[PDB]
Design an enzyme around this catalytic site. Sequence first.
Site, PDB file in Angstrom:
ATOM      1  N   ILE A   1       0.841  -1.192   0.000  1.00 52.98           N
ATOM      2  CA  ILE A   1       0.000   0.000   0.000  1.00 52.98           C
ATOM      3  C   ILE A   1       0.880   1.246   0.000  1.00 52.98           C
ATOM      4  O   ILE A   1       0.673   2.153  -0.797  1.00 52.98           O
ATOM      5  CB  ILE A   1      -0.950   0.022   1.212  1.00 52.98           C
ATOM      6  CG1 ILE A   1      -1.883  -1.195   1.171  1.00 52.98           C
ATOM      7  CG2 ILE A   1      -1.762   1.327   1.246  1.00 52.98           C
ATOM      8  CD1 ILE A   1      -2.802  -1.244  -0.054  1.00 52.98           C
TER       9      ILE A   1
ATOM     10  N   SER B   1     -11.528   0.269   3.617  1.00 52.08           N
ATOM     11  CA  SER B   1     -10.795  -0.817   2.949  1.00 52.08           C
ATOM     12  C   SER B   1     -11.002  -0.829   1.425  1.00 52.08           C
ATOM     13  O   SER B   1     -11.897  -0.160   0.904  1.00 52.08           O
ATOM     14  CB  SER B   1     -11.253  -2.166   3.501  1.00 52.08           C
ATOM     15  OG  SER B   1     -12.605  -2.405   3.131  1.00 52.08           O
ATOM     16  N   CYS B   2     -10.199  -1.628   0.724  1.00 53.50           N
ATOM     17  CA  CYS B   2     -10.360  -1.806  -0.718  1.00 53.50           C
ATOM     18  C   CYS B   2     -11.764  -2.332  -1.056  1.00 53.50           C
ATOM     19  O   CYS B   2     -12.434  -1.832  -1.967  1.00 53.50           O
ATOM     20  CB  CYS B   2      -9.264  -2.745  -1.273  1.00 53.50           C
ATOM     21  SG  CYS B   2      -8.735  -4.137  -0.209  1.00 53.50           S
TER      22      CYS B   2
ATOM     23  N   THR C   1     -15.130 -10.643   6.672  1.00 55.45           N
ATOM     24  CA  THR C   1     -14.807  -9.271   6.345  1.00 55.45           C
ATOM     25  C   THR C   1     -15.881  -8.338   6.901  1.00 55.45           C
ATOM     26  O   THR C   1     -17.071  -8.633   6.831  1.00 55.45           O
ATOM     27  CB  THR C   1     -14.667  -9.063   4.815  1.00 55.45           C
ATOM     28  OG1 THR C   1     -14.553  -7.667   4.533  1.00 55.45           O
ATOM     29  CG2 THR C   1     -15.858  -9.624   4.075  1.00 55.45           C
TER      30      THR C   1
ATOM     31  N   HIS D   1     -11.517 -12.692  -3.663  1.00 55.45           N
ATOM     32  CA  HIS D   1     -10.424 -11.770  -3.420  1.00 55.45           C
ATOM     33  C   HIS D   1      -9.064 -12.373  -3.745  1.00 55.45           C
ATOM     34  O   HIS D   1      -8.789 -13.504  -3.396  1.00 55.45           O
ATOM     35  CB  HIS D   1     -10.449 -11.318  -1.942  1.00 55.45           C
ATOM     36  CG  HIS D   1      -9.706 -10.048  -1.702  1.00 55.45           C
ATOM     37  ND1 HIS D   1      -8.329  -9.994  -1.641  1.00 55.45           N
ATOM     38  CD2 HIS D   1     -10.143  -8.774  -1.554  1.00 55.45           C
ATOM     39  CE1 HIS D   1      -7.951  -8.738  -1.456  1.00 55.45           C
ATOM     40  NE2 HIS D   1      -9.033  -7.979  -1.406  1.00 55.45           N
TER      41      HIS D   1
END
Lengths: 333, 333, 333, 333
Positions: free
Chosen positions: A12, A149-150, A209, A177
């Site tokens: 990141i 988050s993504c 998640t 994912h």
Amino acid sequence: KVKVGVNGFGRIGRLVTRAAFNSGKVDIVAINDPFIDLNYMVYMFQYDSTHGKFHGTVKAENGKLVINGNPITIFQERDPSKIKWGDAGAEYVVESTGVFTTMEKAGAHLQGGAKRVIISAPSADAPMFVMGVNHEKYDNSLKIISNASCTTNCLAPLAKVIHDNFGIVEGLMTTVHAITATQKTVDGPSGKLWRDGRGALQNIIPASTGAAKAVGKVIPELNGKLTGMAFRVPTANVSVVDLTCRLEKPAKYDDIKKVVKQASEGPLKGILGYTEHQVVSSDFNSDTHSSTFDAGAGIALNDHFVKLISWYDNEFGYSNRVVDLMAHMASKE
Amino acid sequence: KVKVGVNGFGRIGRLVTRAAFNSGKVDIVAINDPFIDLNYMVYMFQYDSTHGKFHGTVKAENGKLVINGNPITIFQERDPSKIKWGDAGAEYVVESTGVFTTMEKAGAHLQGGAKRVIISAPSADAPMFVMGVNHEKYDNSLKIISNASCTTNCLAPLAKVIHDNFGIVEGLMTTVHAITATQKTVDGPSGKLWRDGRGALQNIIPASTGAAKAVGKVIPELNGKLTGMAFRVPTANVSVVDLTCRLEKPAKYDDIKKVVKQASEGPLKGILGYTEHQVVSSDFNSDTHSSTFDAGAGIALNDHFVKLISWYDNEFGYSNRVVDLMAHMASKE
Amino acid sequence: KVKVGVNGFGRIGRLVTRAAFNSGKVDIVAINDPFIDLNYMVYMFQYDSTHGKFHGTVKAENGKLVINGNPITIFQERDPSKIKWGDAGAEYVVESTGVFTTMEKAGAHLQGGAKRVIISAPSADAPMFVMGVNHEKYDNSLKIISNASCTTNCLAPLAKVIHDNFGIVEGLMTTVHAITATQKTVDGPSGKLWRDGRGALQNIIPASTGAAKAVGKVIPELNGKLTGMAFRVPTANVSVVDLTCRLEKPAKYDDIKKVVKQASEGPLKGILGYTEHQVVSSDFNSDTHSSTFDAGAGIALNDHFVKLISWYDNEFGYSNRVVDLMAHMASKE
Amino acid sequence: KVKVGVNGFGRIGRLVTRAAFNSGKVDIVAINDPFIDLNYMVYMFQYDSTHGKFHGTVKAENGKLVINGNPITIFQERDPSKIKWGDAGAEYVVESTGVFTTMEKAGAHLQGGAKRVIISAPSADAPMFVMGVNHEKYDNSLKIISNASCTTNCLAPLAKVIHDNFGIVEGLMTTVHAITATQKTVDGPSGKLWRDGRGALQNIIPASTGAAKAVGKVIPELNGKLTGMAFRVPTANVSVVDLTCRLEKPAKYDDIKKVVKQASEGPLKGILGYTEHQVVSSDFNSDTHSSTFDAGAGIALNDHFVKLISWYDNEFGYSNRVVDLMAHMASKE
Ligand SMILES: NC(=O)c1ccc[n+]([C@@H]2O[C@H](COP(=O)([O-])OP(=O)(O)OC[C@H]3O[C@@H](n4cnc5c(N)ncnc54)[C@H](O)[C@@H]3O)[C@@H](O)[C@H]2O)c1
Ligand SMILES: NC(=O)c1ccc[n+]([C@@H]2O[C@H](COP(=O)([O-])OP(=O)(O)OC[C@H]3O[C@@H](n4cnc5c(N)ncnc54)[C@H](O)[C@@H]3O)[C@@H](O)[C@H]2O)c1
Ligand SMILES: NC(=O)c1ccc[n+]([C@@H]2O[C@H](COP(=O)([O-])OP(=O)(O)OC[C@H]3O[C@@H](n4cnc5c(N)ncnc54)[C@H](O)[C@@H]3O)[C@@H](O)[C@H]2O)c1
Ligand SMILES: [Zn+2]
Ligand SMILES: [Zn+2]
Ligand SMILES: [Zn+2]
Ligand SMILES: [Zn+2]
């Protein structure tokens, strides 16, 4: 224009730095990573298995990391409160290590003279923002924030459009994912999360998640109306969301396509994409959208019950949103 | 007891042959495959990248394939109407080539003397059966039938239990599915289905599937109440179903766990499995269940809206069900 | 400048087309492929799992494929003797299907008005050429020629340099090779080559190759002095040669490094590369070199016995060499 | 007979334990791993992505790990000198953490009452032994020894046979090696070995290894005559060696096959295998040989220069040799 420091030079941290230089919307002036010296930083930034060699120049000179001729100050501090961000000119700090996600821990960066801190992960208590969804709720009293988050950045823009137009009664999400750095090459220890220790090459791995529930934070009307789970699969990058939702107003699939396409061309341009092409995951590698609606892949049972598919480069989309968020914050100063 | 012929010595043809010899429920007496000669059959049957070396003996002797001392007649015919099943003593034929799935095309085997044909795939018009769900609807007037798909055999037993107890108002399914022989190692031609030509090792690939809709044929009360889609991902075997459904009567997730577990220990034993362990896909390699409910992986939003997760070895479960089906048919003659 | 037709729009056909437009060294004016119609061509050329989306424009218009504004005539003939290359203005034809690699079969393109044919694979009887090694032996009497294999193009330039400077007494090569279109996703039929039928995702697969022996054709002094074999491994692209050779003159590793680097900066620039970086295979994805010497990876037992490592993008390097060979041919007329 | 403790319950620690229970040659009575508590050990031992579920019973009871009814004492110590091996009755300790490989560090186990230590890895100074090659050089004066590496155990038995019959003048080795726990799922930090930090799924990665040179320690006549290197490739298990050597006496390839087959059936039975089958890596999964000669895969340039190929399950063969070596040590007491 705004000068930025990056704590952590992991996936990141490096890709936020890459997005900053690619887009030019912010100026990186400092990086901290105790486990990566200067010469190694050059190598890790320049070569990337997933996104290819950096487009531009990178080199070490006089103890600085020089990217496209711009010198960057390098720190090697384990304790965030000890990093001298201020002396380096860093105004905003991107907290990308993954281990300082609370207000308390992320706030350490302020002791060194950072003015604001952007946490590149969900936070238990820092305010979360998603570009295109609630970023206009940001204001200058906020010194520590989170870019979620993504997965939340993929789901929220699409949920916004669907909810705005048809009303989501309830929804359940699955994300398929790509693997990440927290996973293992072969069966190994993951004490808090046993499935996640199992070999990433060999296995489809279910995982929890909070991303769907988190959409309820950025879109308050959806609080309590969404949840979901994930499967990790053996691909290096690019992920996909499957949102199965019940709608209160009737929504022919062709009407869904129309409003998503309209959103992608106007207020959510660059954030929410729209495609009718016969795409697969590699077609989104290095794609900078948060979310790209796949018209052809989704399916409706009836006008009130639909499954919607949206792709995301979990690395690049998110990285560019961190940059966009900082650029927006700077514009509000 | 019933003597069986196999058309197409592929993943399913070979594993049906393994299941037959491992269980002893049916006797394989003939195999046709124009693209695999006798000496090559020995090799392909003996060694399996996914399920390991055959436990038993296999050799070529006097122009026959001999497995565990049982000679098998080998044919090499492209045209199914020309295979002399009757001369070889094959009473039932497993049609596992993938290219003869209508009653008209599969019926060609009757011209060479087969009495019944079992299509190892969905059929546009042949009656479909799933063991544990509607196999008792089979009767002796049916000369050509289908055992549905691997995915339908996963979903239907679970849907049966949920519907029997709580009722399914509507459901949408996603399957995360292992790669198969119809896919490509690198981007190549697939003119009818463009996404399916894209490199299977590199991509998550969305695909259409009629499997959830087919559940409405084997469970008539669910006709029109289910549909879904698939993602192909780079694993060589084992798949997983994600069923998102609305229940007509409310159920706590613990209530759901209870009735699925009870079904797995009683009437669906060996067909529907139940686990609370922290499983990943490789834990199901060579598992002979049609479906194994993953209690920990699922999630409920509320008492009426839930996502249920079930694993299946798409090669091995299905192959065993083909044998089970034929055994049941033979018991009815 | 020379106008080119491509028979077979496959990994190599498409990437030759892509190299032609990227480099501008030749002009593609016609394409034949019976298994890919015009609209499908647009899709297959624009999206590529390995090399990403085409950098430029591609569309269908007036029955033509239009790449970067250049219109391309599209044929759909199974029989190469029936393709009207002459009418479409194609002077050279790239025979890239993999099924017309003899002079007798490739020569069919001459019937439809092509002037020369370049076989993008080893040929049993067409003269073979490797750029940088023996391309100066091409002459205008040769109407049908071969660009050899990807592996031969990697080995030969390196072998040329080592042999020119130190003399190779004997050498044995191994190549660790990315998967290709001839391989299978799961265990399937490959009757002439049983190991090549085994699942490509799951296996390291040994394979015979005439690539090392073929170096003795493009470097006659090395006839009989080289051979080798391959291992196929589960990566989508980029391969590596490991050449173990005995040298007649003494060669310190630093001296080998010196002469290879010198070659890469001179006569073999663009063909033979040189690196001391800590590289891995993905660093060579879309690299247009035939061969890149990895200084850090090789090892010497002594001054006469060494193992030399050279990387190659088996798709992109070779494609660019086909284009370079055609440009070289055109410079002779 | 001999009672064994295992330090480090990882791939090797767990498979050593499996091998011990399968062969019955030694008794496992104690395990130490600070990163895997008792309930988690049950899970990690019972389920294995690569080698499948443990055939036998495993549970936690009364604070002991109980395998096939045998209770095992579990320790959780980071410091090896603090493990109470003596109290648990462990006489030999398998040192399989990967971080205590010198005699000084491995010797810490003697402080807690172990009598001898076997390092499951190469050691800079502990004597190294390979079963079938020099294990008879072990004597009772050696309290800390090494079982070398997986690769050295593959190469040495083969080199012994070749050298015994034909004399190896010099050789160079390549191993194409499965990924291991030291590698990374995506590009991450590996500050001492930069290539090793690059994503293991995406890349062929060259690596140094002392394995070939080590053959010169277990076969003293080959000191200085061998070296080599490795390529890591994206498979979860099973590796292969490629040995290129010059021989002093002429060796027709059929004569090489003859003496290797002879060795595999006699003095090296169970250690060196021999096959003429068309094998690929998955055919060796869970194969307990140290080395299996692949007759069809090798190639000779001439009577004095050959490339020999041998397969090894790097996890399973090696784990069985650890157990074999300990049983042999016990026989010398
Ligand atoms: N693989 C799975 O997971 C799975 C599960 C359930 C159902 N199915 C279905 O089973 C059928 C076969 O699938 P598969 O995975 O075994 O494919 P496969 O490619 O592995 O096997 C099919 C084969 O039939 C052979 N064949 C081709 N044409 C033939 C002909 N005219 N006559 C006789 N043999 C011929 C081929 O040589 C090959 O061996 C398909 O319908 C598939 O959809 C597959
Ligand atoms: N892919 C590599 O790494 C590589 C490198 C060097 C050389 N080569 C060689 O190039 C050639 C092509 O290999 P590829 O990797 O591109 O395989 P590919 O399967 O991707 O390409 C083959 C193409 O030819 C088409 N085709 C088949 N029959 C045809 C016909 N009668 N007429 C016209 N088109 C037809 C197919 O539709 C397909 O698109 C082979 O000979 C190969 O040995 C490949
Ligand atoms: N995996 C192979 O193919 C292979 C083959 C032969 C030898 N080896 C060698 O065996 C050793 C272990 O390799 P592995 O593949 O099993 O690695 P691994 O990572 O799977 O296992 C290492 C284990 O040791 C544990 N551990 C770490 N520190 C510890 C400590 N202070 N005290 C006790 N336990 C500790 C870890 O939790 C882990 O479970 C290494 O030296 C390796 O080089 C590996
Ligand atoms: Zn209710
Ligand atoms: Zn000829
Ligand atoms: Zn001219
Ligand atoms: Zn008890």
